[PDB]
Design a protein around this ligand. Structure first.
Ligand SMILES: [K+]
Ligand SMILES: [K+]
Ligand SMILES: [K+]
Ligand SMILES: [K+]
Ligand SMILES: [K+]
Ligand SMILES: [Mg+2]
Ligand SMILES: [Mg+2]
Ligand SMILES: [Mg+2]
Ligand SMILES: [Mg+2]
Ligand SMILES: [Mg+2]
Ligand SMILES: [Mg+2]
Ligand SMILES: [Mg+2]
Ligand SMILES: [Mg+2]
Ligand SMILES: [Mg+2]
Ligand SMILES: [Mg+2]
Ligand SMILES: [Mg+2]
Ligand SMILES: [Mg+2]
Ligand SMILES: [Mg+2]
Ligand SMILES: [Mg+2]
Ligand SMILES: [Mg+2]
Ligand SMILES: [Mg+2]
Ligand SMILES: [Mg+2]
Ligand SMILES: [Mg+2]
Ligand SMILES: [Mg+2]
Ligand SMILES: [Mg+2]
Ligand SMILES: [Mg+2]
Ligand SMILES: [Mg+2]
Ligand SMILES: [Mg+2]
Ligand SMILES: [Mg+2]
Ligand SMILES: [Mg+2]
Ligand SMILES: [Mg+2]
Ligand SMILES: [Mg+2]
Ligand SMILES: [Mg+2]
Ligand SMILES: [Mg+2]
Ligand SMILES: [Mg+2]
Ligand SMILES: [Mg+2]
Ligand SMILES: [Mg+2]
Ligand SMILES: [Mg+2]
Ligand SMILES: [Mg+2]
Ligand SMILES: [Mg+2]
Ligand SMILES: [Mg+2]
Ligand SMILES: [Mg+2]
Ligand SMILES: [Mg+2]
Ligand SMILES: [Mg+2]
Ligand SMILES: [Mg+2]
Ligand SMILES: [Mg+2]
Ligand SMILES: [Mg+2]
Ligand SMILES: [Mg+2]
Ligand SMILES: [Mg+2]
Lengths: 73, 155, 119
RNA sequence: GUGGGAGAGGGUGGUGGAAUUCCCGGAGUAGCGGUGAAAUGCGCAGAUACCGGGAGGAACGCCGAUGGCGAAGGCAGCCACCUGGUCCACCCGUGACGCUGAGGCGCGAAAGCGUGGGGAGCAAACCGGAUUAGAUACCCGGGUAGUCCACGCCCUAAACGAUGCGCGCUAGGUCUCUGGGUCUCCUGGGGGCCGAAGCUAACGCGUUAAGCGCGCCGCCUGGGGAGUACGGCCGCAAGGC
């Protein structure tokens, strides 16, 4: 049910369309480089749809990873 | 037993040593419902245990039964269309049952003339770690743990 | 004869076989094992017990090179992956970390008919 | 008209990473693979597994959904350019300029055809291995056309909501996409579920009507024969109407 924390509530005022701000978009990625679902980010449809493309832009720029490796399995 | 759990029968204690295991061995020796003949055979075998071994026959009997008890066995299981020999542990009651049954069966395989000599010699050899019953235990613990690859079919 | 004393451990676990490759921190292998290296020949290689045997055999082969601490890397969803994990975990070798690096594509190539109804 | 909005709507060019295959090198040893179990197969010319580098083609993981867009087929990495549709607010302009639509014209998944190119993965036919009483199959190892691109054909479908288009009227509740606003909520458009009246043979439909009406087009008239024959038109052919 993802009752741990919502990423939006765990954050303040920020730009969703900024593809250069890494230290905020890192919080929206999972342990792997994958994009978190709606239940984890706590965003809306429009917010999530914008976050997706901005994260992809940051990935292509080389700031965010495409995929990572799981640890402690 | 499908509906219930099939509780175990409690046996009367032995009329001499007061051990229910002795009575169970009497019953495994019993044939055609002859309790007196089976008790005669077993008590004469106990008389043979002494004057051949200085130890009391109760200790020899219990130690032999402990030496015959198998730790793991192997049951067949139908998986994926084939039939596999799956190894798994053994409940203590089945350990006792198999031990006594193997003792009796291996005793009747001996070349000794009369029954009491057979039971006595089998008990002694099983106590000191040899005989047909210990061979049966080793064969079962070989079959099991010889198919260790199927241990995940435990169920 | 290299005396590595520290390296990596790749576990390729599939439904048909589990195979362990013990390498150095640069990735170059030292020894290895699998279900076929052990007496198992057919389907018995895709067994957790066979995976344990392969892991322990590779570990003992690595002991000859005097290796103590390892870094485990898991690839592939197959029976006996966690069994090889637990085998290497207490085998004289110190396990420093376990990492799952199963290669997942981004829907690049068309799978075989056996793996279809997906992309 | 003015001001705004969302979108995998379309076309062109460029570009990103994961993975598969192949090649080069390093390291490394006796099998890998595959199945219900196997064998063909590949491996001492050094495979599999591992690391690094390189080439090429194809599809875009998470986001992603019961979501969005389009008239339908259908559309999913990212960026840019060109471009279509559509929705809302203001009540500004024209002043019935509207609806439908036989023909015509255009679009039209996949497969297929022509010319040229490309060809990594997959894979009709086919070559084998198994299974079986047999196995021209399911299972396994290979593999050509093809899948891909350009241009030109082909016009089919469970082309499906099995429900033609437009407008008006007729209880609501709930979920959701997207605007606007006095932003508990109201209002408008779109996607779902439950249900008033009513309809239906029933299942079910029920402001996204299959209800109540109106306009226009398409089509049906027992089953087989048969979407066959003949004829015509279209097509390079397969074949289609
Ligand atoms: K061979
Ligand atoms: K849809
Ligand atoms: K060709
Ligand atoms: K039709
Ligand atoms: K609003
Ligand atoms: Mg016997
Ligand atoms: Mg195998
Ligand atoms: Mg587009
Ligand atoms: Mg090489
Ligand atoms: Mg092969
Ligand atoms: Mg080959
Ligand atoms: Mg050969
Ligand atoms: Mg040689
Ligand atoms: Mg390879
Ligand atoms: Mg490579
Ligand atoms: Mg090439
Ligand atoms: Mg999805
Ligand atoms: Mg729509
Ligand atoms: Mg469709
Ligand atoms: Mg006016
Ligand atoms: Mg006027
Ligand atoms: Mg019209
Ligand atoms: Mg027309
Ligand atoms: Mg077509
Ligand atoms: Mg085509
Ligand atoms: Mg062609
Ligand atoms: Mg060609
Ligand atoms: Mg193939
Ligand atoms: Mg094939
Ligand atoms: Mg064949
Ligand atoms: Mg048959
Ligand atoms: Mg045959
Ligand atoms: Mg051809
Ligand atoms: Mg449909
Ligand atoms: Mg229809
Ligand atoms: Mg309708
Ligand atoms: Mg609505
Ligand atoms: Mg209903
Ligand atoms: Mg009613
Ligand atoms: Mg009803
Ligand atoms: Mg209506
Ligand atoms: Mg008729
Ligand atoms: Mg007909
Ligand atoms: Mg007819
Ligand atoms: Mg036809
Ligand atoms: Mg004709
Ligand atoms: Mg002609
Ligand atoms: Mg034909
Ligand atoms: Mg025809």
């Amino acid at each position: 049910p993802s009752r741990k924390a919502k990423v939006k509530a765990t954050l303040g005022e920020f730009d969703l369309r900024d593809y250069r701000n890494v230290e905020v978009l890192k919080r929206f990625l999972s342990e792997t480089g994958k994009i978190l679902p709606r239940r984890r980010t706590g965003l809306s449809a429009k917010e999530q749809r914008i976050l997706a493309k901005t994260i992809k832009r940051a990935r292509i720029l080389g700031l965010l990873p495409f995929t990572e490796k799981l640890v402690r399995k | 037993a499908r509906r219930r759990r099939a509780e175990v029968r409690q046996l009367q204690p032995d009329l001499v040593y007061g051990d229910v295991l002795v009575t169970a061995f009497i019953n495994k020796i019993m044939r055609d419902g002859k309790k007196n003949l089976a008790a005669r055979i077993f008590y004469d075998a106990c008389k043979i245990i002494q004057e051949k071994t200085g130890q009391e026959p109760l200790k020899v009997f219990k130690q032999a039964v402990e030496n015959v008890k198998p730790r793991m066995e192997v049951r067949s299981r139908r998986v994926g269309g084939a039939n596999y020999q799956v190894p798994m542990e053994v409940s203590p009651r089945r350990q006792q049952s198999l031990a006594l049954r193997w003792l009796v069966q291996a005793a009747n395989q001996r070349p000794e003339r009369r029954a009491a000599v057979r039971i006595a010699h089998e008990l002694m050899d099983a106590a000191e770690g040899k005989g047909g019953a210990v061979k049966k235990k080793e064969d079962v613990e070989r079959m099991a743990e010889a198919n260790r690859a199927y241990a995940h079919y435990r169920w | 004869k290299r005396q590595v004393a520290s390296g990596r451990a790749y576990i390729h676990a599939s439904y048909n076989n589990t195979i362990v490759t013990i390498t150095d921190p640069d990735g170059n292998p030292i020894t290895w094992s699998s279900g076929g290296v052990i007496g198992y020949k057919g389907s018995r290689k895709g067994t957790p017990y066979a995976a344990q045997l392969a892991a322990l055999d590779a570990a003992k082969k690595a002991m000859a090179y005097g290796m103590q601490s390892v870094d485990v890397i898991v690839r592939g969803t197959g029976a006996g992956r966690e069994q090889a994990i637990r085998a290497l975990q207490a085998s004289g070798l110190q396990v420093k970390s376990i990492v799952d690096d199963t290669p997942v594509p981004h829907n690049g190539c068309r799978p075989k008919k056996k793996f279809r109804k997906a992309s």
